[PDB]
């Protein structure tokens, strides 16, 4: 496990002349206004990741934020209306455009309620990671070797399930819908950061 | 009278059509648009008048109205955004765009309120009173009444006036800009509900 | 008067019943029919009047009513289908067929709505007002009122008209078939609810 | 486990001359008008199945209709408001007369509210198959050894589940109630694709 | 006047009290019997009149009260049965009985509803007007008003007349044995809500 | 585990001159007038049972019904409310008195929403006997060993959990209260029976 | 009239307020503090009369108003208080101190009802009639209607009068220590429900 | 584990020289007013505990009641809001001041909905204790080692997590709302007590 541990930033974008990242973070909890970003985890494809330590207070990320804004570059994500919420409300930049494996597997795994990640990973690459766990305060001074780990682990798979579910996406006809949910997703994370968490907008 | 034109199949041409966004609503025999074909369409200029179109039974084609549904300098203006656009794709094979919805836009500006049915928003913004939406009437009846072609009026006659304060108020409360990226994304809800999605928010955990 | 003609126990004879399709409803003491007993049948040939029978406690025949619950001649229409099925075979032995059921058919066609009752219908599809079905009755008592006999009539008198519009409607909109499949289960559906199955749909997953 | 693996249909009815057939189906979903069917998997009732490979757009199977249209031949399901839903909706033909385990389970063993498949042949048969899974995309262009023998499972223990199930109606009374269910069940699933499958058309 | 008459803590004496049954409900300032003290007691003989009786805070005795409670002799009537022997045991220390529940044998007997409140049964078994039990009274209050004089009292003008109407009923459709056990364990049904247990039955699987 | 298996009734009541036995049921559901009494276990309470396999259609058990008739002998169950229901409707008498282990259980182990017999067999005991199970049915001509075994353990602790739960009530001040919903009991059963299973007669 | 006064961002001085409590309340833009903001103040020294100051979108400071917020010798009296206590904080700066919460009161007096609120206990406790809290106003408008300057100060010319009643109800039934330490804590639950706790019971198990 | 065992009180108060005292209790259930205080378990925080069986009807407890009361010694309870109502309806007095392990986590272990005992022991300390069991009846006349050790590991850790709690909430700003929550929470036991356990009288 090709792991590289930062405080605060990438140092430079050598590891990032790609044209996607994968990304996720951990935080505090649920709520970003209350809970505060601790983690970046990005990885460029290439099965290495970068695991950057969020200090409380932390207003700019110059290098993650270049990769944020570059529109050229499609952010890749599992928890994608999450993170990207966090991301925006910690550094100020809403990234895009962004790929979320989350929406692709509720349109593509249509034989199951179960969207998590850990599964996929199972069920489309023979891959095992743990699940999303509540045991671990991510605002700790020092984090652990299994903390950057497991941090890893949700990052290193992200473009290979992309490229699994694109082609579900087209084999099933549902690319240009998928597309469209892509595009919209960062509104939707910005209402929620907006007062409209619990809300589906498109309701009734 | 002149308030309420009526006509069987489609719009007999455009000529009151002339204009830059166009009020829209439907009838159907009910909610599920497989099995509930489209019986009405009524449609407003913005001009205080109405035009109510019967639709047949098995009908594919209604060709000037399509055209407006197609037309990309014409914004569609809906309060039903999510239903109609859903029945009109269905029904004649063009999903309309672009277009704004007075409901999403009245739950981005009216959050003081769990209630954002046109008929509250009609009374509240502009003093204007209609009907709720009934349950009563069989829209695929060989004869509507006059009482039915005023109630389908009352559905557009007014939507020219809640989007320009519904966008007034998105401009004041700093929420336009989220706003059109839901009018962007509405037509895709249409289709991901034709496409099996429909009691399912595709963005939720 | 003439509309309405009150009977004990029984049909005096079958004089007013030289029909093909008779509607039945029926008051008891609730809605368990293995502890609240049968308490009236109403029946009406579809000419505009109907008949009013006082069934006393433990009674355990009416042989000229049976004759026409047993005649595979008479379609029993009835709006209450399923539950009076199952209180008329528990009272007397036969399970009434084959029937026509208006709430069974409402579902089938008024797909715009979920109000099925029978009032409601009467209303929508006739122009006609009646009593919603009330919980103020204790129909086992020994004298019955005019407005209770008034009120068990208007539960008969229009299901013919009632059946004659949904029948038009299920052809209209291509349901006949599932509709008449239907009404073939209906008793066993009754028969369920007696074997204790009251509470389950059979077809569930 | 003798399977006989198809693509498209049977070849011929060569071991179809039977009285009643096992049906089940493979999908990719619970919603027929979304979820394509992907699998037809059938036994003669002599312990060999056929699992039958259906491909995306596949418009006839002319041997399989011709037994679901037979009259004098029953069609055995356990999901058989769901496998007559599926069929219909494939190949145009409703197929009737039906037998379904699951009714007769329901109507038989009064005693629980359990009444999978594998329940089922567990407590009536001793014979011991996997629970329906949600871990497999039944679209996949090459089916796996393991999938076929999970296919063919569904469908090798129905003759004898309905012959105990028969006796278990005759015993307690209910034989003739259980045949209206199964004239009716066609006509549920009509239903359901018509657009009631959320309603139960007898509810008061 | 002579229909109502109010006193301070306790009857005067018991010369209106020389019966085989009364008629006894209470106001109190809440649900909770340990937190919500006894504020009125009222009770009928069941001769069309009404004793209202004024309980002040931290009373402990009502000596003339209390002798109907105990005399095993004197049924004592409710309609909020569970409700009222808990708070009078809770306040003077003795459990009444025997009882009659007009609520229980409402249940057993008009099994068409699932209405038995003492408005409903007044109005359908005997055609009197009363209201339903309100929440808008302080009875805690120093001075009672007229109105509210009435209120209390009309709760137990009528429990004798429902009585006689359900043990009627309770004859007629075979349940009176039934009925009657459930009185002898309404008062352990009590006790045990004053023990812990008011959110549970106690006979459930 | 000392087991007497029987056809239909005691053969006499040679075992039974004591002043309470132990009952239990076991039928083909929990709705009596659909699903039939098959089984009646019954203990003395002195470490053997009886196992009476009832017929369908079997109108008189005389022998049995002595003691359910019998004021003098208390019947002790622990699924009461069911079990007087089933046998006051296959035999037609309601019997009487009777004591509850679920009753006084809820009444004394005040700091537990677990009443089962499993349970209190292992809590108050330490004796080791299985849950309640869906996966017999007790119509079968022929009762196995490990279902006469079952039937019996139900009925072999009756007598001491009474004992226990008799020292619970007096310590903690509840002997009359329990006394009260025993005498109540039959009549809970028997407005079952009447139609009002699904209702507590004295919610408000 | 004399009855209300109307103001721009903040009292004109503070002439009207030489006393030791004040009735407050707000109108906003929703229930959600962070998205919704403050419109209105409405505030009463308790003589009948009523200041409505309207705030503008992005106002920061209020310093008359402030001050009083922040006298610990004057008490601010809520029935709306653990959201007011939150929008008034959020807008200015200050969490209002010490506090009175009428509806607060209500639950630990008015112990019979399950209905605590304002135009209930105006009713109840004062015979006055208010209208209850509406969802049909804009309180963003740059023109604030005479019956919407008259609906914002019913929710204030009371609150006095509520308290008085609420302190003897309090006393009376042995809850005033109770009661206080309730209001002490409230100022906290406001800034709970701030920091992202709004929708948890810190206390609950 | 130092456990010293006493009936009806502590005999003096020789190990009780500190600043705060860690407590917990055990009784016949979750009703103050019907289920008996059974034991108070309570710590110095030294490593040892004293665990003290409180009798039927017993009215006084001199030595703990001097503890609870004196301004000068912080109580501190995981279980606050259920452990003081019950000291308070046993011996007259409600304990003050108070701090609550549970409170203290919720605003703090933001990133989990997990606040009971053993998670946080585990969590914050890695000390393995015993989730709250519904098996023991704690007003038996004679107690098992088993259950002094269980009432002593409820104790033996709380000043420990206090200090780790209290450095999160400093952390994390909230130091000011948890000491808010504390001063309060005597009066929600006393409310409790009052009448209103199952209300928020916070509630709108």
Redesign the interface.
């Known amino acids: 496990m090709t792991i590289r541990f930062h405080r605060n930033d990438l140092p430079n974008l050598d590891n990032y002349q790609v044209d996607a990242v994968a990304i996720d973070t951990e935080?505090?909890?649920?709520?970003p206004?209350?809970?505060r970003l601790c983690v970046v985890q990005i990885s460029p494809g290439d099965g290495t990741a970068d695991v950057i330590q969020i200090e409380?207070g932390q207003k700019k990320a110059p290098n993650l934020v270049k990769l944020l804004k570059d529109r050229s570059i499609t952010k890749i994500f599992h928890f994608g209306?999450?993170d990207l919420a966090v991301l925006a409300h910690a550094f100020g930049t809403m990234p895009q455009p962004v790929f979320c494996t989350?929406?692709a597997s509720?349109?593509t795994?249509?034989?199951?309620?179960?969207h998590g990640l850990k599964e996929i990973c199972s069920?489309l690459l023979d891959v095992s990671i743990s699940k999303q766990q509540?045991?671990?305060?991510?605002?700790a001074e020092v984090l652990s070797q299994a903390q950057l780990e497991y941090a890893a682990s949700d990052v290193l798979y992200l473009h290979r399930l992309k490229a699994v579910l694109e082609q579900?996406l087209e084999?099933?006809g549902?690319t240009?819908?998928a597309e469209?949910?892509f595009?919209?997703?960062p509104?939707?994370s910005?209402?929620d950061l907006?007062?409209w968490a619990e809300?589906?907008?498109?309701?009734?």
Request: net charge positive.
């Open positions: 935080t505090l909890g649920l709520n206004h209350r809970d409380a209306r999450f989350k929406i509720k349109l795994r249509t034989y199951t309620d179960r069920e509540q045991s671990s305060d991510w605002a579900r084999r099933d549902r240009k819908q469209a949910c595009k919209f997703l509104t939707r910005e209402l907006m007062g809300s589906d907008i498109f309701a009734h």
